[PDB]
């Protein structure tokens, strides 16, 4: 209700005020980007420290077996040396008795040579009395019971160890023509335009649980208590994708377990996140398909198209920003058709997801 | 009363013994081989039972290499789980950055043309835009799981320690030289040492032999060795393996429970049977003897009742070159028990007697 230079100034002044805050927002993000990569290294070392902590503990056990291994071996070589040393003795005992009898042999063999003599009789009359006797070796048996007992205890230790290792591990003219082409395509042709959808933790409602590198959304039993945020849903149990699309062709698949109270779709970034109006299908900025008591319905702007119920529980969604259509498919083996929308879109679209029945779960597919 | 017939009656029965002695000697030669073969027989049985354990321990070593990698995989999975979520959240933050970077440039572009009237119009829509700062959610590493693996691995170490214990616990001028030798010290006497070996042929049925045949002791039951001419039948005696007729010799004997036992020397000719075989009671045996802890030197049924002594190691010295045998008492120093001055007729074997159920004679090898 005024002038030029003052309006130019009233703009310019409050305009750069936001620019100066955006610097500190962006540098506030840049710090958080660094904190994450630092925190990855922080964990990477904590892994190695707990691994090296086990590499010690296993080497302690490995050395304990090297003790017992030598300790049982010593025992066997002692029993070996005991017996083999007795043979080294008995060999010497026999050896003496041999050369003893070898002498009396030669004493007789020498005396026989001179049978010229009369005193052949005299020199051998004393030799009549000598009478040698044969050698003998006593009972030298190796202790089998002791050596079989060690082996048996060592066999027992192997199957005692096996027991305890288990106890560790066990516990329009062009536009319409292109639509028809895409409507008739097969699963491999649709998968050429794939993009890995990522869930956004900013967007997820308090009772929506996110997991598996933020690719699995499900119903929470308790409120998860995320931070308050403008982009977070306050009324309805909803969550959005990370990336939005205004140019090109896109496709993604979603697996829906316990298909009872859940829904998949697309949404403009402008859609309000708060109040009952934020609910998907009930405004001008959201197109989706939805299950309610296992009855399939396509929704947009408070309008219900009650569809035929289907077997499949993998929903493939295709989007064409170049021409202007979004298509919903049912996938079990083949590609069945659920519904389509013919729209020239105003702005970029984020993928959109809803889940309500305590059990339902939406998962991004990457085949 | 004839020559050639006596020469023949000798010659005939003489070579009969010679021909038997061949078969005796070849009968020994076989036994010499049997022993050395039986040593090898045991030596392989040792290695086979050792190699049998070397397998069994390596089986256990590999079992730990499995669990070691199996628990490590589990930790690296929990690492990758968390680090992959950061790789996501980095991309989530990255989008929110460039999102706000755009609206910055949209505003920075619009400021340049403040010449225009439509500076107001083109930035009136830009008034409403309001960016908000980033946030990182709770990404905490599962400590309970990693401490639990470590605790079970600590438990396995002390479970193993338990069972390694269960392996090992259940298996539990003549006159002038005499005087010189009489005055010698223990190191000088030990220069003429010879390791005495007991002879199993000689030992009486109630005399037990052990420790590579160097320890004689009283048997409780009759040991029932083979019958042999050289074995004692009456008295509890045993002799040495080697006999000595030339040179100087020495040996030490430890006598536990010195009550009814005795040490000495003996000629090979001594008869082993009957009461006469007893050591000290004939012309072929010299010895020292304990009877009710009273020391006596004996030879040919003659007693010299000596002074009782403290020591229980008897050192015996023999001099075949000159002709004397000496008995010493040894505890720390070398005390003298008795001597014999004899020009010996033939070679001497060391000789030993034990009778009190408990007494034990052991050869010392310092």
Residue numbers in the entry:
A (entry chain B): 188 to 358, 434 to 629
B (entry chain A): 189 to 360, 436 to 629
Copy the relevant paper text.
Tripartite motif (TRIM) family proteins are RING-type E3 ligases that play key regulatory roles in innate immune signalling pathways that lead to the induction of a type I interferon (IFN) response and production of inflammatory cytokines through activation of the IRF3 and NF-κB transcription factors. To understand NS1-mediated inhibition of TRIM25 activity on a molecular level we have determined crystal structures of the CC domain of TRIM25 in complex with NS1-FL and the isolated ED, and of a TRIM25 CC-PRYSPRY fragment, which includes the RIG-I-recognition domain of TRIM25.
The CC-PRYSPRY structure has one and a half CC dimers in the asymmetric unit with a crystallographic twofold completing the second dimer. Each bow-shaped CC dimer has two PRYSPRY domains bound towards the ends, maintaining the twofold symmetry. The 73-residue long linker (residues 361–433) connecting the CC and PRYSPRY domain is not visible in the electron density so the exact connectivity is uncertain. The footprint of the PRYSPRY domain on the CC, which corresponds to a total buried surface area of 1433 Å2, spans residues 269–287 on helix α1 and residues 320–326 on the extended connection between α2 and α3, all on the same monomer. However, a key observation is that both domains bind to the extended region between helices α2 and α3 (residues 316–331) and strikingly, binding of NS1-ED necessitates a considerable distortion of this region away from its structure in the PRYSPRY-bound or PRYSPRY-unbound CC. Using interface disrupting mutations we show that PRYSPRY domain binding to the CC is required for RIG-I CARD ubiquitination.
